[PDB]
mmCIF file of C-alpha atoms and ligand atoms in Angstrom:
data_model
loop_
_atom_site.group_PDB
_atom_site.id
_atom_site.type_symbol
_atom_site.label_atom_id
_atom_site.label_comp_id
_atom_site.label_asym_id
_atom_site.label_seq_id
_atom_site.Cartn_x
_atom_site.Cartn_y
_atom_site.Cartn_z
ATOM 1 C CA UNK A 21 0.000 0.000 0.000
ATOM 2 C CA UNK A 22 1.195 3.713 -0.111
ATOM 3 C CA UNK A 23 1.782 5.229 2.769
ATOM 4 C CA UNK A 24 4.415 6.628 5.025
ATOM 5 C CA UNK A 25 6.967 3.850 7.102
ATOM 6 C CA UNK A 26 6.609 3.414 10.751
ATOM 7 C CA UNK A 27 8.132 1.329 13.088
ATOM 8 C CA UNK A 28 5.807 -0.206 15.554
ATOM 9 C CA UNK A 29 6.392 -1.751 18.619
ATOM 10 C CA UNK A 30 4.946 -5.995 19.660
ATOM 11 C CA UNK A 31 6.193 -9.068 21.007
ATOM 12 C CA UNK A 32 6.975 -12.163 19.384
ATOM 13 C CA UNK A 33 5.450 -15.588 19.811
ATOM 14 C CA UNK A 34 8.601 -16.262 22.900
ATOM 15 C CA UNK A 35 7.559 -13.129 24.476
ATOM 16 C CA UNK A 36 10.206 -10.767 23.657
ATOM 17 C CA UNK A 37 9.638 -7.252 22.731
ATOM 18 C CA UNK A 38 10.613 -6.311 19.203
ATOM 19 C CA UNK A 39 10.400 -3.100 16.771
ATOM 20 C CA UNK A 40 9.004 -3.777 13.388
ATOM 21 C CA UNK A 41 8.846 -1.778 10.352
ATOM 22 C CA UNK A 42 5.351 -0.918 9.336
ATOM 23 C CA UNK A 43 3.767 1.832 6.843
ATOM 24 C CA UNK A 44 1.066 3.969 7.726
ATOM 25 C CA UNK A 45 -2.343 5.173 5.579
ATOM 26 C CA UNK A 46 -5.628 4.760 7.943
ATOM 27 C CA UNK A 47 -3.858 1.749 9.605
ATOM 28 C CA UNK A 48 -0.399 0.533 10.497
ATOM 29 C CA UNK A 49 0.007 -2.254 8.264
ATOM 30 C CA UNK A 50 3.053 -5.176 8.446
ATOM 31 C CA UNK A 51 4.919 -3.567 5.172
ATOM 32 C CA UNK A 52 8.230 -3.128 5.468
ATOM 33 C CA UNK A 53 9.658 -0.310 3.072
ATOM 34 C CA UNK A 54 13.247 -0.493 4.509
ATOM 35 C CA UNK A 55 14.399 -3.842 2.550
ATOM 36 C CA UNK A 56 14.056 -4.371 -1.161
ATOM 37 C CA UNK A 57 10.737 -3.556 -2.738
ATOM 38 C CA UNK A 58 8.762 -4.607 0.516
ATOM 39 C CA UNK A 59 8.274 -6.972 3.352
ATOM 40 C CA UNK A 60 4.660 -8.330 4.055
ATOM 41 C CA UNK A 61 2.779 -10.053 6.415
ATOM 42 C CA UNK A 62 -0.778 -11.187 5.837
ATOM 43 C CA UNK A 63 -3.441 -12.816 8.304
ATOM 44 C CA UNK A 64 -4.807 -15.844 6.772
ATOM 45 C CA UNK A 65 -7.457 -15.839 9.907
ATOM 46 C CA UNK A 66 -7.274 -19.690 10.316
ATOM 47 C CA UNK A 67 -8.946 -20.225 6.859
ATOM 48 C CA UNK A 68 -6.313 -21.572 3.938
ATOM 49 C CA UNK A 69 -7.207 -19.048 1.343
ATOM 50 C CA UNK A 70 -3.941 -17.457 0.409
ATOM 51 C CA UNK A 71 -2.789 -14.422 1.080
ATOM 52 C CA UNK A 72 -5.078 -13.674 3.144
ATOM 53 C CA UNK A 73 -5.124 -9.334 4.229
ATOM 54 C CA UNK A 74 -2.242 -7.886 4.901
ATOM 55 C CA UNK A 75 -1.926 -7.093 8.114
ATOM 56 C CA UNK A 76 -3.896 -3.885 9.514
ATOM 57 C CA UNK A 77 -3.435 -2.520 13.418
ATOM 58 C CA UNK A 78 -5.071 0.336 14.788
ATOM 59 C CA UNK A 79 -2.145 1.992 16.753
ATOM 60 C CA UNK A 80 1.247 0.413 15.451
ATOM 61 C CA UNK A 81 0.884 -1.507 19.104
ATOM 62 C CA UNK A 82 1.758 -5.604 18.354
ATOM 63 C CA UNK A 83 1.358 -6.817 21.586
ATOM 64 C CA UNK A 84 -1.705 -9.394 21.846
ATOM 65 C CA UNK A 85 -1.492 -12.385 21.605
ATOM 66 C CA UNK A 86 -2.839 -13.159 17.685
ATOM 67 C CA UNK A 87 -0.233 -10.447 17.276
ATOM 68 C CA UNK A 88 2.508 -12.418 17.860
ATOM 69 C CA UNK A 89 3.330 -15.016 14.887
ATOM 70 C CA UNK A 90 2.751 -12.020 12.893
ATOM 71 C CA UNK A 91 5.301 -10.194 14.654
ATOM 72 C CA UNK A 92 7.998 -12.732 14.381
ATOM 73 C CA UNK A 93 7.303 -13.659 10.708
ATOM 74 C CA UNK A 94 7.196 -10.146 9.533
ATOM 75 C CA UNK A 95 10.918 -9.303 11.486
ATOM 76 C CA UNK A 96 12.333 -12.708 11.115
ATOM 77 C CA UNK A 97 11.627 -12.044 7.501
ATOM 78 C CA UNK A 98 13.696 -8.816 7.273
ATOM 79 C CA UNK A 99 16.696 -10.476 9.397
ATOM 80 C CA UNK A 100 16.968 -13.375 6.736
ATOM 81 C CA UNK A 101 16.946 -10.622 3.889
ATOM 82 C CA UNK A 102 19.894 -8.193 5.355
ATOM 83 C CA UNK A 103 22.039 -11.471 5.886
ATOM 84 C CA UNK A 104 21.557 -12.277 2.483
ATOM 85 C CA UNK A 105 22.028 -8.842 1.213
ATOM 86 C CA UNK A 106 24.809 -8.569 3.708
ATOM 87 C CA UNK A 107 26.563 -11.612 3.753
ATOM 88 C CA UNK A 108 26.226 -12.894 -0.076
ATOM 89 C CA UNK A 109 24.936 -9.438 -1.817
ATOM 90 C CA UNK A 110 22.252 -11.174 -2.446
ATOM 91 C CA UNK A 111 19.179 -8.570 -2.983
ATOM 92 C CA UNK A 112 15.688 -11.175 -1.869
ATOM 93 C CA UNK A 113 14.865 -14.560 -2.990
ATOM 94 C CA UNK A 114 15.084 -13.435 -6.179
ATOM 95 C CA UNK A 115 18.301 -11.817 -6.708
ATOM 96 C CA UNK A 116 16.179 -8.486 -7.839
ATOM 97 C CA UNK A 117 14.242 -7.540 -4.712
ATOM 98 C CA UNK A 118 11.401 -9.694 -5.233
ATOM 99 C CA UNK A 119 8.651 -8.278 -2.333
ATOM 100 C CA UNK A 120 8.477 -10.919 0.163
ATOM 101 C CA UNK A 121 5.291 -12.633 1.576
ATOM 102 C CA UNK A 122 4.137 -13.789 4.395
ATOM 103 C CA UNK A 123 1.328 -15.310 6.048
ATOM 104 C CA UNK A 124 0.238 -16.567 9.192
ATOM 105 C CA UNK A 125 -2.175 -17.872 11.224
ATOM 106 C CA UNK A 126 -3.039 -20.586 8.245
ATOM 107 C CA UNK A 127 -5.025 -23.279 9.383
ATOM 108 C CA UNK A 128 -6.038 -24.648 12.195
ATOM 109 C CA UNK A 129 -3.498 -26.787 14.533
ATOM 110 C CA UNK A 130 -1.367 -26.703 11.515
ATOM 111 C CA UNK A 131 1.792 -28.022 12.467
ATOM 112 C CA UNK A 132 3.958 -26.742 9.452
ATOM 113 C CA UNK A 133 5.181 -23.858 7.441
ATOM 114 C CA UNK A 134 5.896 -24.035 3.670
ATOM 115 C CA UNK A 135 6.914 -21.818 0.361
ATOM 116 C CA UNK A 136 3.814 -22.193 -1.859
ATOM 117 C CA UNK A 137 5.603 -21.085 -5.091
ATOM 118 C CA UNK A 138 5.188 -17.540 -4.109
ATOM 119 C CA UNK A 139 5.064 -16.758 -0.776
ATOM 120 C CA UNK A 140 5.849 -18.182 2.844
ATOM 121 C CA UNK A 141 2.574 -19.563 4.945
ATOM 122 C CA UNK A 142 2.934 -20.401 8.818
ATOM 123 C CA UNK A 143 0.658 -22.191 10.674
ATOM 124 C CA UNK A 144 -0.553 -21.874 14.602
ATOM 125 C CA UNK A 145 1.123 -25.451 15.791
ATOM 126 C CA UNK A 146 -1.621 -27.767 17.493
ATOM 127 C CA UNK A 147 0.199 -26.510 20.697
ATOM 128 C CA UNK A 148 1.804 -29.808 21.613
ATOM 129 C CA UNK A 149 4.374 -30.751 18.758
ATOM 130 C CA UNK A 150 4.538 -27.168 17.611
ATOM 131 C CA UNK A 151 3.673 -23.377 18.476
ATOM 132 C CA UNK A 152 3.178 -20.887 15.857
ATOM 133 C CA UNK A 153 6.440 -21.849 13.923
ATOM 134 C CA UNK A 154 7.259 -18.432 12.850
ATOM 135 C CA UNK A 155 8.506 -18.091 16.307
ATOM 136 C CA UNK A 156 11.578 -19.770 15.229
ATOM 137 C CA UNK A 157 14.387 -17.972 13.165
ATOM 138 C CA UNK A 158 15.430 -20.907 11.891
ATOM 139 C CA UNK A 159 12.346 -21.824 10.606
ATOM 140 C CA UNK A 160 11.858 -18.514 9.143
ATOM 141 C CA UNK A 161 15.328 -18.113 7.270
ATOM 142 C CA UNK A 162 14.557 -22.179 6.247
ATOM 143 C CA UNK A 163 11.100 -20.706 4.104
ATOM 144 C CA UNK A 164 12.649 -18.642 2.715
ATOM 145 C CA UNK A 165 15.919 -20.196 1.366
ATOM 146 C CA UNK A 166 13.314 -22.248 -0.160
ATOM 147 C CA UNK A 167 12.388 -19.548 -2.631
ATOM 148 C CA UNK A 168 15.929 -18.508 -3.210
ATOM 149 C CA UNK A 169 16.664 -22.433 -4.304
ATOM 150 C CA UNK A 170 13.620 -21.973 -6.391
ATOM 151 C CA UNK A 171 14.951 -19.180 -8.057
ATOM 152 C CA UNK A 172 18.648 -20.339 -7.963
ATOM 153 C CA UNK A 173 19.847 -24.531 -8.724
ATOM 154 C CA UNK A 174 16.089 -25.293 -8.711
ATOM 155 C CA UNK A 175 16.608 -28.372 -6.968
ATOM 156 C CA UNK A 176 13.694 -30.962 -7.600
ATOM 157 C CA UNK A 177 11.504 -31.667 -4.443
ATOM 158 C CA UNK A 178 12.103 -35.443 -4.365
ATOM 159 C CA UNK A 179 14.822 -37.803 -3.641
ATOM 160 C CA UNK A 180 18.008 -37.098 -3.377
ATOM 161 C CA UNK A 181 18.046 -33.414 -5.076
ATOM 162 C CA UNK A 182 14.782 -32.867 -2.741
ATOM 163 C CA UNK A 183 16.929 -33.717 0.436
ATOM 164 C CA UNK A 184 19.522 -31.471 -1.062
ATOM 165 C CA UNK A 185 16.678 -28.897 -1.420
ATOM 166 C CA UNK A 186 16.167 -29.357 2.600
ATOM 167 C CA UNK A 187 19.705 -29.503 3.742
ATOM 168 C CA UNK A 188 19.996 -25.832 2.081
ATOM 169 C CA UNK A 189 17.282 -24.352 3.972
ATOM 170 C CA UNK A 190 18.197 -26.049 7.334
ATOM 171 C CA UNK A 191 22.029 -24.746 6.450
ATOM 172 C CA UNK A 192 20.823 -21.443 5.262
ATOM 173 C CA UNK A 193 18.529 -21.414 8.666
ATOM 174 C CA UNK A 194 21.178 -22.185 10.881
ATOM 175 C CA UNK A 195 23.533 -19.556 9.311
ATOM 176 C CA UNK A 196 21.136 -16.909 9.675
ATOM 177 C CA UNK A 197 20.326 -17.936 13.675
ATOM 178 C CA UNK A 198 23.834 -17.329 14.112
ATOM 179 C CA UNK A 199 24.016 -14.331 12.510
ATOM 180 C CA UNK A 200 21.526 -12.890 14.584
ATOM 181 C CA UNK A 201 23.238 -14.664 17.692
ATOM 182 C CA UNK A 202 20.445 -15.219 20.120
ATOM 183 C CA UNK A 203 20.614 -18.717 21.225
ATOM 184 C CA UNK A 204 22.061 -20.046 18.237
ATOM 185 C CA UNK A 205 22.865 -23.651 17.265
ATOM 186 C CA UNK A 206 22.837 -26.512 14.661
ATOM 187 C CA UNK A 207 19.506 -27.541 15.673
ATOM 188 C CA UNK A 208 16.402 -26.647 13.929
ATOM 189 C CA UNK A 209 12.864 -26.010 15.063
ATOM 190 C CA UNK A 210 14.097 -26.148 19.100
ATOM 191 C CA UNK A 211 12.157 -22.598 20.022
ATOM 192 C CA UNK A 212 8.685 -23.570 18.303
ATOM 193 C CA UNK A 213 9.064 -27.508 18.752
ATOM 194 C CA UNK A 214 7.363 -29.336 21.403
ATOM 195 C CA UNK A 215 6.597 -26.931 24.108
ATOM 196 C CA UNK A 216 6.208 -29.473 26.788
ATOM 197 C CA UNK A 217 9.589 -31.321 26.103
ATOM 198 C CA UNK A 218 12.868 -29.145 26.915
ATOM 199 C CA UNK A 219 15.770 -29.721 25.208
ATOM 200 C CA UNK A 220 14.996 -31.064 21.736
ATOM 201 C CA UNK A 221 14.453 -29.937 18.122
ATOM 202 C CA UNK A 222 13.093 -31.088 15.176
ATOM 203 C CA UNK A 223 15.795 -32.056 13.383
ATOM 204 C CA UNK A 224 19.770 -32.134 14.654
ATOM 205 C CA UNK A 225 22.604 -31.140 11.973
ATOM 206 C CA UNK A 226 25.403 -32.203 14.841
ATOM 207 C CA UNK A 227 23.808 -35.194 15.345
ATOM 208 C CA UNK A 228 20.914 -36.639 12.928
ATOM 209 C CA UNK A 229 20.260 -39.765 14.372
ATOM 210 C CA UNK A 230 19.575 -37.844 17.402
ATOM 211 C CA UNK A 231 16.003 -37.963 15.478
ATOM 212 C CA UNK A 232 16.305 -41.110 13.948
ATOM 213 C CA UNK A 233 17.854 -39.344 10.867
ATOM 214 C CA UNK A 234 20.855 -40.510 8.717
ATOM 215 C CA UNK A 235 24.234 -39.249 9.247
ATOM 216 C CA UNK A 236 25.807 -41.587 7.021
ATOM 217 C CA UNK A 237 25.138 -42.310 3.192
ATOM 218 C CA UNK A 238 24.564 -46.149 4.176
ATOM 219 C CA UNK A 239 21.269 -45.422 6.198
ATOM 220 C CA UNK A 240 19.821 -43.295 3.206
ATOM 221 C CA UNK A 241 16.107 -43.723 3.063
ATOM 222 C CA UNK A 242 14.733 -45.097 -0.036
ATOM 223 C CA UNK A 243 11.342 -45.782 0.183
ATOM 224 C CA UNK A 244 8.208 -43.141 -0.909
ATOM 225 C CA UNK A 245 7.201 -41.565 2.043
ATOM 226 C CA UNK A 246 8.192 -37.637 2.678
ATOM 227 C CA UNK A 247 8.819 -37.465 -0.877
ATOM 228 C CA UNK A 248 11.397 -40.114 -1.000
ATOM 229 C CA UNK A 249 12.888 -38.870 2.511
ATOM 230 C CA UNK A 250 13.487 -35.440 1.658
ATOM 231 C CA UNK A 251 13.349 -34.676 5.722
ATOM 232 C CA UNK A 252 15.173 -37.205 6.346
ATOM 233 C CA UNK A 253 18.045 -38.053 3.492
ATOM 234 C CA UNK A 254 18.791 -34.115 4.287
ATOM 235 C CA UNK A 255 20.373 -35.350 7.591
ATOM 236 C CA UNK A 256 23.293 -36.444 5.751
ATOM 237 C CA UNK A 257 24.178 -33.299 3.941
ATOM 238 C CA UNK A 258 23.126 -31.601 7.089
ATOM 239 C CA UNK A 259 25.886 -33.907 8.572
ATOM 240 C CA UNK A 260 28.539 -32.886 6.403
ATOM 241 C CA UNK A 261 27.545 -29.290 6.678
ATOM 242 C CA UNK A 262 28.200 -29.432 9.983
ATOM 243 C CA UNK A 263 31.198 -31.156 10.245
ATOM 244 C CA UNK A 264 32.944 -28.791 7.688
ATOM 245 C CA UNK A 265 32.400 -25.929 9.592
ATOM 246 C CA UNK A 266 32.746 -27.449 13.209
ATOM 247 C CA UNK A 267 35.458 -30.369 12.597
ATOM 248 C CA UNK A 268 34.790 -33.892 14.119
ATOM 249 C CA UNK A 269 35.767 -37.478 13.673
ATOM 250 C CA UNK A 270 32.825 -39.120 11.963
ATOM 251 C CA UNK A 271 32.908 -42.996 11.467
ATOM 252 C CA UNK A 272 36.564 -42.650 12.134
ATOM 253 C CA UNK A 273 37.347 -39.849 9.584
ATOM 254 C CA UNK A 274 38.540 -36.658 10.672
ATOM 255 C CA UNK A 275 37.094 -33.254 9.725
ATOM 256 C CA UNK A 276 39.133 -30.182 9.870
ATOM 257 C CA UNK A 277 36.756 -27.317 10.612
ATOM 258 C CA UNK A 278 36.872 -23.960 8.727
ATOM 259 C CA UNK A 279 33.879 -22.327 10.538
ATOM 260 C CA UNK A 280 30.322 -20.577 9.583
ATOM 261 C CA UNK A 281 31.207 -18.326 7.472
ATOM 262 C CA UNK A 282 33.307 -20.382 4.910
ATOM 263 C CA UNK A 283 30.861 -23.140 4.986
ATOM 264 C CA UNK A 284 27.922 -20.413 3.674
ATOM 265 C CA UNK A 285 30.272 -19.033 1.329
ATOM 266 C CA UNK A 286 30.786 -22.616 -0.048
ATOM 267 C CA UNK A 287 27.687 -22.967 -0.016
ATOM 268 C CA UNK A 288 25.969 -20.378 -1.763
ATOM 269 C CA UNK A 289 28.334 -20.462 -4.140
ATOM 270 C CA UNK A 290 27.093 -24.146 -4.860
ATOM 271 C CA UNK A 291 23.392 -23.668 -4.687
ATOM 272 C CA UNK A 292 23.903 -20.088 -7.214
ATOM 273 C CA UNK A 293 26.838 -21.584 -9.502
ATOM 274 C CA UNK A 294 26.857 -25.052 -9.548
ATOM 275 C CA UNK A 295 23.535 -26.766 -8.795
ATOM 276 C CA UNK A 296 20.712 -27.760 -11.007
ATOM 277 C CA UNK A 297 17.241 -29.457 -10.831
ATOM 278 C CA UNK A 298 18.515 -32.669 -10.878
ATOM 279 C CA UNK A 299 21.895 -32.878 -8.854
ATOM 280 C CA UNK A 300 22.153 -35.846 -6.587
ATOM 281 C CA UNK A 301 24.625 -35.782 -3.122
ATOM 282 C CA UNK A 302 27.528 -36.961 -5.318
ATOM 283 C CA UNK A 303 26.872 -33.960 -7.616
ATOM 284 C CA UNK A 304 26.995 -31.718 -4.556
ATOM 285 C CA UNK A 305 29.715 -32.538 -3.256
ATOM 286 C CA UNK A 306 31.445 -31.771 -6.645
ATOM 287 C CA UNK A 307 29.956 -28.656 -6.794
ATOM 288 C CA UNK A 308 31.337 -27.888 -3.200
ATOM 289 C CA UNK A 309 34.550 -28.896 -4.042
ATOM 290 C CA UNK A 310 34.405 -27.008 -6.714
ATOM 291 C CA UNK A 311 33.095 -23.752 -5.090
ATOM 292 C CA UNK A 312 35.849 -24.036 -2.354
ATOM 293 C CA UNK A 313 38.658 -24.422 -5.328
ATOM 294 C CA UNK A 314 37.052 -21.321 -7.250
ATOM 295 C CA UNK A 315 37.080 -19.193 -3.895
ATOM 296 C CA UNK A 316 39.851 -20.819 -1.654
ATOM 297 C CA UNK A 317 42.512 -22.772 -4.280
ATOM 298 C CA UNK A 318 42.858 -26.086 -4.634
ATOM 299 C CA UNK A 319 45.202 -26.696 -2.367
ATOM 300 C CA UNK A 320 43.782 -25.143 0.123
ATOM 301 C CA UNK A 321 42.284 -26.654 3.744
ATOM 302 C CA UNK A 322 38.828 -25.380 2.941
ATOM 303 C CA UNK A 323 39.076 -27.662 -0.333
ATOM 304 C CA UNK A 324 40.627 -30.924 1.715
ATOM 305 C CA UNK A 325 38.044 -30.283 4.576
ATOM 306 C CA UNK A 326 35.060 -30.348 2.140
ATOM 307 C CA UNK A 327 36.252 -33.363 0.733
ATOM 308 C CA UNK A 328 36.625 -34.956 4.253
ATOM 309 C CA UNK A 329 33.207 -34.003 5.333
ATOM 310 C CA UNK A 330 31.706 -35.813 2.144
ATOM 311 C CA UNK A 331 34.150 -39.027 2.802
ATOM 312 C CA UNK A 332 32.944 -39.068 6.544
ATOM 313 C CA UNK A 333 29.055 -39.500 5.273
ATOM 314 C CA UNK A 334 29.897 -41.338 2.207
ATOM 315 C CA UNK A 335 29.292 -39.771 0.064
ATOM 316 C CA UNK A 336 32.229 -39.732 -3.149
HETATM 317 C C1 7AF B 402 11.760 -26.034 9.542
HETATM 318 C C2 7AF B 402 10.464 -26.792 9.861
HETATM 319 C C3 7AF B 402 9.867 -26.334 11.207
HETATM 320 C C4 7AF B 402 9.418 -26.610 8.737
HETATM 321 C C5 7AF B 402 9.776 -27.343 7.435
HETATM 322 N N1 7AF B 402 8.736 -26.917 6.535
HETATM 323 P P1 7AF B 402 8.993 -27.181 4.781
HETATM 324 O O1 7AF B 402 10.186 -28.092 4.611
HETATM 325 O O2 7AF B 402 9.119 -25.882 4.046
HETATM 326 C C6 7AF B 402 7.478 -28.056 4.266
HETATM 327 C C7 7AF B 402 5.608 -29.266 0.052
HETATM 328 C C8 7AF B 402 5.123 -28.218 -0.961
HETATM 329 C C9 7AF B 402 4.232 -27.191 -0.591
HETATM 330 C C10 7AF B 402 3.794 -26.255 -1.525
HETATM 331 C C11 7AF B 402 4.261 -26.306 -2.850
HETATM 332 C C12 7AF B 402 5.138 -27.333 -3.226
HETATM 333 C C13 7AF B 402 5.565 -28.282 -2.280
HETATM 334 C C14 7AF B 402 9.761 -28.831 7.672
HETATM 335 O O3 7AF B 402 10.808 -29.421 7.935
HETATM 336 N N2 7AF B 402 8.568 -29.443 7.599
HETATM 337 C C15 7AF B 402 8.436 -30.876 7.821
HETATM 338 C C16 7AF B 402 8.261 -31.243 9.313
HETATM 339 C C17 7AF B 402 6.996 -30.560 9.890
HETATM 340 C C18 7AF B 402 8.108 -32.784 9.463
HETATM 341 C C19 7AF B 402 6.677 -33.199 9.057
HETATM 342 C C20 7AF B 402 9.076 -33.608 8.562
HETATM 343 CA CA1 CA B 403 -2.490 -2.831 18.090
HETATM 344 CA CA1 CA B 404 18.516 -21.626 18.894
HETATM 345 CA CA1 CA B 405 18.206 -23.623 15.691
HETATM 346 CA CA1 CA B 406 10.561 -28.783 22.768
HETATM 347 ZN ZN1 ZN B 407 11.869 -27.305 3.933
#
């Protein structure tokens, strides 16, 4: 909408107080004008007709409850854009600064959050395996490296190029929880997930099998379910992600860590130059290898590290 930007004042779904860009005409409405060509946050009002409105408040005030998943999508949203701006002058999903979407409140007990081709879509949580997942920055930053894959390697959602597909987005999420640096970690999901069980996450990228998930090539999954175990499978890229930038001794081979920043430069560098629709996990780890030789040399420890990350989940 045209108007003039605001910054209005809420709290989030953990209870923490937050500003938040909004824009002014009538109402204050969740529009960001400071990033790109827009941030916005609609209010799908429990039905699953999408967008929804965008989101209209009386006094700039985000402090009620319904307020709250709206809060954190809507901010969460502009942290994961300045990280990639900052980080890997990347300008939105799109390269071009493609006005990003939100919407919450979808569903009822929806225990999920997706990219629908166009926009991000949160659901509420049933309130026992999740709360409104926006809550979660991880979560957040994982939605929406799904639309930069879309608009990047393309990465089919199936199989092994589908686990690839998830890996990225936990990756991506977990870079940009540290980049913020409020309680970060290489867990995913662990501030919306299960609020009567402390202590756990969704999914682990330390330790996958944590969750019953594969750290090792030899335990793929390779039956139908989850879209040929694209949850699942991603545990073993998530593996290797982790162990470049951490270090470890995996099934008795020995990662040399390079840290968080290296591994995302790697990284995006693979997903933006190397990728396609169809790569499989020995296809990535070429194109890591390769992104590491392009921005490290190939004799460099980034390059052997990457290549001992992939040997330690067998992957060749
Ligand atoms: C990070 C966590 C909390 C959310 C994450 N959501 P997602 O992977 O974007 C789904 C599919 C489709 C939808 C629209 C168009 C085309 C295709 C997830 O891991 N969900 C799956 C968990 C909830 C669990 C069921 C494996
Ligand atoms: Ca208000
Ligand atoms: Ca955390
Ligand atoms: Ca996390
Ligand atoms: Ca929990
Ligand atoms: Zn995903």
């Amino acid at each position: 909408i045209t108007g003039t930007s605001t910054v209005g004042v809420g709290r989030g779904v953990l209870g923490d107080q937050k500003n938040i860009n909004t824009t002014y005409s009538t109402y204050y409405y969740l529009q960001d004008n400071t990033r790109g060509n827009g941030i916005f946050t609609y209010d799908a009002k429990y039905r699953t007709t999408l967008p929804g409105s965008l989101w209209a408040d009386a006094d700039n005030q985000f402090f009620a409850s319904y307020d709250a998943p709206a809060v954190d999508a809507h901010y969460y949203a502009g942290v994961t854009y300045d990280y990639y701006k900052n980080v890997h002058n990347r300008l939105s999903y799109d390269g071009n600064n493609a006005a990003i979407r939100s919407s919450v409140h979808y569903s009822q007990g929806y225990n999920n959050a997706f990219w629908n081709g166009s926009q991000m879509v949160y659901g509420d949580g049933d309130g026992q395996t999740f709360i409104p997942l926006s809550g979660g920055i991880d979560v957040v930053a994982h939605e929406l490296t799904h639309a930069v894959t879309d608009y990047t390697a393309g990465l089919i959602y199936q199989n092994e190029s589908g686990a690839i597909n998830e890996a990225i987005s936990d990756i991506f999420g977990t870079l940009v929880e540290f980049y913020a640096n409020k309680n970060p970690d290489w867990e995913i999901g662990e501030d919306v997930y299960t609020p009567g069980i402390s202590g756990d996450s969704l999914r682990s990228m330390s330790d996958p099998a944590k969750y019953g998930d594969p750290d090792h090539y030899s335990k793929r999954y390779t039956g139908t379910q989850d879209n040929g175990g694209v949850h699942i499978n991603s545990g073993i890229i998530n593996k290797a992600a982790y162990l470049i930038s951490q270090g470890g001794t995996h099934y008795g081979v020995s990662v040399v860590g390079i840290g968080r920043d290296k591994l995302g430069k790697i990284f995006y560098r693979a997903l933006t130059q190397y990728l396609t629709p169809t790569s499989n996990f020995s296809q990535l780890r070429a194109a890591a290898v390769q992104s590491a030789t392009d921005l490290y040399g190939s004799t460099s420890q980034e390059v052997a590290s990457v290549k001992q990350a992939f040997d330690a989940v067998g992957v060749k």
